[PDB]
Design a protein around this nucleic acid. Structure first.
Ligand SMILES: [Mg+2]
Ligand SMILES: [Mg+2]
Ligand SMILES: [Mg+2]
Ligand SMILES: [Mg+2]
Ligand SMILES: [Mg+2]
Ligand SMILES: [Mg+2]
Ligand SMILES: [Mg+2]
Ligand SMILES: [Mg+2]
Ligand SMILES: [Mg+2]
Ligand SMILES: [Mg+2]
Ligand SMILES: [Mg+2]
Ligand SMILES: [Mg+2]
Ligand SMILES: [Mg+2]
Ligand SMILES: [Mg+2]
Ligand SMILES: [Mg+2]
Ligand SMILES: [Mg+2]
Ligand SMILES: [Mg+2]
Ligand SMILES: [Mg+2]
Ligand SMILES: [Mg+2]
Ligand SMILES: [Mg+2]
Ligand SMILES: [Mg+2]
Ligand SMILES: [Mg+2]
Ligand SMILES: [Mg+2]
Ligand SMILES: [Mg+2]
Lengths: 87, 129, 270, 70, 65, 104
RNA sequence: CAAGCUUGAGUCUCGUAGAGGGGGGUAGAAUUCCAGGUGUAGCGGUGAAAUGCGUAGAGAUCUGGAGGAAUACCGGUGGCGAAGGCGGCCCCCUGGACGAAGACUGACGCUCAGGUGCGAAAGCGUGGGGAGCAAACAGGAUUAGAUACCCUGGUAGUCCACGCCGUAAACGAUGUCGACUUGGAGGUUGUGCCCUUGAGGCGUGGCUUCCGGAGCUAACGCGUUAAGUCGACCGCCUGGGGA
């Protein structure tokens, strides 16, 4: 993911334009990676040694969202309704 | 990762004790000062410190008699997987009377030879022989 | 391309070939004509090549095995199920309203802009004659005399591969594995032919013969000895060398004598 | 090796420089190596136990030159 | 007693041949690192800026051609 | 806009079509908004093995910056053209503008 | 339950090295075969032999051509991956690890029965390819016999696109994450310095190989990459056969 395509997500979701470490930023910076990487595994279905990074990114986003679900239930509903994540 | 700091303190004592060092350190706590506030007053270590303003390092100082080591055996008896809670009817004496057992009562951390006559029991943090 | 689910004996073994790219409608009207079922009998009214007769009404679709129009580009429109041959047929709209039918290459869809002629750029779908094609690129619709029509390599999934361009001749390798000389200025078409899995199709039952117009075939040692050499025996017996109906050996005996074409056959198919 | 002889080179000289210039580039090790098939297990075992015995007789020099005998 | 790390290069461009006509043997093979004494980061860049030139027809593959 | 280092080898009978090739391959890049950094001819060079049964070929080095599409086109012209015998296109990570080592 | 901090765990900036995976090209040497040209009696083989190949011209030797598989030198106890494993060059897509100075979020962490994925070779199905090697098989030998090691041939198979199988001494015969405890030789790879001022000295990081002390072990051996002193969790064994 390119530099000026992460410095757009940091400004969209980041409360300081510098913070890059918030939980919503660290979920958006993975979902705007997985949904861009889905159009590489439609051509090369045998690429397991770079599917392990995709399973890593998915199951780390699941942890960083289930932290949020019990920290602040106010932010979590509007975060999933902004990104489209069903659960 | 770290799932206990007390069996990190005791094993730093014993592995700096059989390796003939003089000044073990660790990160501090509020239980590993009320344990090295019992070990000094018993006499197993000379003097402890604490250094720092935001993250403090506890610096012990071990002791030696005749060139050998003071704390010969030091177990750890109530550990985070399995908690031992004993009542003062059945408090243990370690090595028949010479070794202490750092019992956490409700009235502060104290050795069992005083916390059998202060009339209560509690958790048994560590044997020391 | 799925097996049909075994509901009843008759669909237990069917593997279809289905394709959703096709046209679910009526063919282009000014390109049909009549191809009536000749029934395997000539003007003398006798059965000459057996097993044929029955089936379904096969309306011919005219198709351009020449591709004569040089220069002008040509957009593709849709694809259709021409029931004569085992390929599929694209419908082509040229830049000035003329529609035609051509054979469908492997990488074809609705949106391609092919171009026929001498000066065509090299991409699958295009055609150009074989002193401007580069060597190795596999072609279909290869003609044996310049301007006749696409004759070589015209089935469902075949190709021929140009291997050598020397003198004023080119050398191919045909799909049956035989090399062949062709005049260096015949009109070939780049790329393969689309529907590449006709051989996966198992028909399934008896009825898919006599919906395609193939009658039964009675093997030789059934008959009584006035109809075939293999007959006879009070039970089963095949004590004679395997022959045709009409006397000739069948298990290997070569039957090629067209000696006016042997200037061009470089090596036989092995 | 392409040994082109010089001007007035005697023949044993311009032959032994060829034999040396063939032993150096080592075609008689290589065409001995490609004579048979050594599996990827046997070749790896050979080129591990042919490095531990370069280690041991690189080392044992500088220990057996510490204990005299007379 | 190396050369590249001494002279302070950072890339071995293959397009120079006056250097690589020292680091190939008589036949055309590559002389090993425990003979030229080249450090084992620049030996890899040497073994690729030889194999580019052998393709691009500046250095032979064997002695004969 | 990843840079590139292209080199191609044309045939010494057709050695009089290299200004045509140079001023027709500056087109597909510099009209495709990719800048042009260094561009050298190398003359005729002795090879050191037979390629298409000859001995002297003609080298042109072209170090140029481009979008990733036109260079992905520029190999097809070299392949289906038969004027050039070989072509190598490398992806230099930066933009070199020094003289070539074999200009001297 | 409620509120906080930065050392656990993570994100961002700039870079470095690598046979990490998936797809498409292309280059050179050789083995075989085909078409010839020069050429005359033997070649091939083993411990010695024969089977086989040659007077219908083999074997050598030269030019030309089709095709397939593998990548000499580099190549090293060297590098990458979680294991299985991965080697020519070039281009597309893509996964990690590591240093450097910082900014940020505030325990988000560790292990995991049943689950779900990956998992060398052999096999198996459907469709292609087949140069080399090569179970079965055929012949010549050695032998008391030789269904064998040796020899001349050779089909499955090896290879490619897509599906099953889910096993190996899958070995470091050592589950994974963390904290401590004397040293010395290397190799590979980052980086801030000091007269860098050709190969110099002063440092701090990760990863891997030998030798060795306390301590441990039945011994061999291990030895800061522990089989040392500990904490968290899971797997597993209880006499040999039967199995
Ligand atoms: Mg018939
Ligand atoms: Mg039949
Ligand atoms: Mg019948
Ligand atoms: Mg009858
Ligand atoms: Mg009869
Ligand atoms: Mg009978
Ligand atoms: Mg009978
Ligand atoms: Mg802070
Ligand atoms: Mg903070
Ligand atoms: Mg399980
Ligand atoms: Mg297999
Ligand atoms: Mg198979
Ligand atoms: Mg097959
Ligand atoms: Mg074969
Ligand atoms: Mg054999
Ligand atoms: Mg079988
Ligand atoms: Mg097992
Ligand atoms: Mg292994
Ligand atoms: Mg092992
Ligand atoms: Mg095991
Ligand atoms: Mg034990
Ligand atoms: Mg050791
Ligand atoms: Mg352990
Ligand atoms: Mg043990």
């Amino acid at each position: 993911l390119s530099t000026e395509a992460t410095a757009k997500i940091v400004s969209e979701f980041g409360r300081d334009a510098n913070d890059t470490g918030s939980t919503e930023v660290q979920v958006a910076l993975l979902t705007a990676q997985i949904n861009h990487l889905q159009g590489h595994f439609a051509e090369h279905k045998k690429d397991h040694h770079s599917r392990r990074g995709l399973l890593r990114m998915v199951s780390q986003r699941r942890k960083l969202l289930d932290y949020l679900k019990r920290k602040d239930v106010a932010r979590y509903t509007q975060l999933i309704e902004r990104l489209g994540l069903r659960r | 990762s770290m799932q206990d700091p007390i069996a990190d303190m005791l094993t730093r004592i014993r592995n700096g004790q059989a390796a003939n060092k003089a000044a073990v350190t660790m990160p501090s706590s509020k239980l590993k000062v009320a344990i090295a506030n019992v070990l000094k007053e018993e006499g197993f270590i000379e003097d402890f410190k604490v250094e720092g303003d935001t993250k403090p390092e506890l610096e012990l100082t071990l002791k030696y008699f005749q060139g050998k080591a003071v704390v010969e055996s030091i177990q750890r008896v109530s550990r985070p997987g399995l908690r031992i809670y004993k009542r003062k009817d059945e408090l243990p004496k370690v090595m028949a009377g010479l070794g202490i057992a750092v019992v956490s009562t409700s009235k502060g951390v104290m050795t069992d030879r005083a916390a059998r006559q202060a009339g209560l029991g509690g958790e048994i943090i560590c044997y020391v022989a | 391309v799925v097996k049909c689910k075994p509901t009843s004996p008759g669909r237990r073994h069917v593997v279809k070939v289905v394709n959703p790219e096709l046209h679910k409608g009526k063919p282009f009207a000014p390109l049909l004509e009549k191809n009536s079922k000749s029934g395997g009998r000539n003007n003398n009214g006798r059965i000459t090549t057996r097993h044929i007769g029955g089936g379904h009404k096969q309306a011919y679709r005219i198709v351009d095995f020449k591709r004569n129009k040089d220069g002008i580009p040509a957009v593709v429109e849709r694809l259709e199920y021409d029931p004569n041959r085992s390929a599929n047929i694209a419908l082509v709209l040229y830049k000035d309203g003329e529609r035609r039918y051509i054979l469908a290459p492997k990488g074809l869809k609705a949106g391609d802009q092919i171009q026929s002629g001498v000066d065509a750029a090299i991409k699958p779908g295009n055609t150009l004659p074989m002193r401007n094609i580069p060597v190795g690129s596999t072609v279909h619709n290869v003609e044996m005399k310049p301007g006749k029509g696409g004759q070589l390599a015209r089935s469902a999934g075949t190709y021929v591969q140009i291997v050598a361009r020397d003198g004023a001749y080119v050398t191919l390798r045909l799909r049956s594995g035989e090399m062949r000389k062709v005049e260096a200025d015949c009109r070939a078409t780049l790329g393969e032919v689309g529907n590449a899995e006709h051989m996966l199709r198992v028909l399934g039952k008896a009825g898919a013969a006599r919906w395609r117009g193939v009658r039964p075939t009675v093997r030789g040692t059934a008959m009584n000895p006035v109809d075939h050499p293999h007959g006879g025996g009070e039970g089963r017996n095949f004590g004679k060398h395997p022959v045709t109906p009409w006397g000739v050996q069948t298990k290997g005996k070569k039957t090629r004598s067209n000696k006016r074409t042997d200037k061009f056959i470089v090596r036989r198919r092995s | 090796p392409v040994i082109k002889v010089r001007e007035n080179e005697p023949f044993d000289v311009a032959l032994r420089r060829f034999k040396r210039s063939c032993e150096k580039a080592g075609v008689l090790a290589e065409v001995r190596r490609r004579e048979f098939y050594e599996k990827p297990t046997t070749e790896r075992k050979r080129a591990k136990a042919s490095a531990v015995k370069r280690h041991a007789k690189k080392l044992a020099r500088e220990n057996a030159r510490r204990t005299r005998l007379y | 007693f190396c050369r590249f790390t001494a002279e302070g290069v950072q890339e071995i461009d293959y397009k120079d041949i006056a250097t690589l006509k020292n680091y190939i043997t008589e036949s055309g093979k590559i002389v090993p690192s425990r003979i030229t004494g080249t450090r084992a980061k620049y030996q890899r860049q040497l073994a690729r800026a030889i194999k580019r030139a052998r393709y691009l027809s500046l250095l032979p593959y064997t002695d004969r051609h | 806009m990843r840079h590139y280092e292209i080199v191609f080898m044309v045939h010494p009978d057709q050695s009089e079509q290299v200004p045509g090739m140079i001023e027709r391959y500056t087109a597909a890049i510099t009209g495709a908004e990719g800048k042009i950094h260094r561009l050298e001819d190398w003359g005729r060079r002795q090879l050191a093995y037979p390629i298409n049964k000859l001995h002297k070929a003609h080298y042109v080095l072209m170090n140029v910056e481009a979008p990733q599409e036109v260079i992905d086109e520029l190999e097809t012209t070299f392949r289906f053209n038969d004027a050039v015998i070989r072509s190598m296109v490398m992806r230099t990570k930066h933009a070199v503008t020094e003289a070539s080592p074999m200009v001297k």
